[PDB]
Amino acid sequence: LVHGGPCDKTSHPYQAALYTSGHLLCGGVLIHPLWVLTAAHCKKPNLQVFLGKHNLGQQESSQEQSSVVRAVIHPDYDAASHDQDIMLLRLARPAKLSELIQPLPLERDCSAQTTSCHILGWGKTADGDFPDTIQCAYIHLVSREECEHAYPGQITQNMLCAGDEKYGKDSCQGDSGGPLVCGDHLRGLVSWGNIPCGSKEKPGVYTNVCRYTNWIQKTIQAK
Numbered sequence: 001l002v003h004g005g006p007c008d009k010t011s012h013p014y015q016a017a018l019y020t021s022g023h024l025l026c027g028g029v030l031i032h033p034l035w036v037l038t039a040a041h042c043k044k045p046n047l048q049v050f051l052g053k054h055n056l057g058q059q060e061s062s063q064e065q066s067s068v069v070r071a072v073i074h075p076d077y078d079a080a081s082h083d084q085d086i087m088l089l090r091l092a093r094p095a096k097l098s099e100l101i102q103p104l105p106l107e108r109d110c111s112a113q114t115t116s117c118h119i120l121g122w123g124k125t126a127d128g129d130f131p132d133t134i135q136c137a138y139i140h141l142v143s144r145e146e147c148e149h150a151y152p153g154q155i156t157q158n159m160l161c162a163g164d165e166k167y168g169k170d171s172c173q174g175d176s177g178g179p180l181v182c183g184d185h186l187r188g189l190v191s192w193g194n195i196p197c198g199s200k201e202k203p204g205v206y207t208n209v210c211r212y213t214n215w216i217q218k219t220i221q222a223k
């Protein structure tokens, strides 16, 4: 995340860190004790999910680790266009909830009224480095018309745009799959956007979570 700052220790209990081959890969969102939501482009072998983390560099009493038993990529995911960039991960070990480990409810209304939005993650910062401490930034949803002009013929109804006109606060590589939180509800997932990261003109592109309500429920309630 570029142009943000360190999060308050107790404000991100839904945040997951996704690892592959012992290295941070993506962010994720805890949505149920057994399920983490992330982007489909975060699919890698033998993912390890870390919950209740703040600083990646140290062992924290609040942390919980789990391997993934099932990875469910949306059937209509299209890698080239990032369309329908969403995946559900079933945890081997259900999340032991605490003040620092809690699920985030989903936004179900695609026409939800404007609320304060924020993004968070351990992705690439302004200096080009990966932070040990989780970063946060307040951002705003961008009108679909403005986003379509920014990315001609690339924005589908399964995507939502967000950014910041003042400093260009934006999500980046490593934040992928992490949450776009609006009014204490999951509104989007970090998917793609401007490279180098910065949202002053080309806003960040997020998977539009409200479109996936039925698919998420059907996957979680399957078998």
Ligand SMILES: COc1cccc(C(=O)Nc2ccc(C(=N)N)cc2)c1O
Binding pocket: 025, 026, 041, 042, 170, 171, 172, 173, 174, 176, 190, 191, 192, 193, 194, 195, 196, 197, 198, 203, 204, 205
């Ligand atoms: C495993 O996932 C990845 C691997 C390599 C690169 C990326 C990446 O560049 N993502 C990305 C780019 C721009 C934005 C933005 N809003 N400006 C957000 C995310 C990646 O996600």
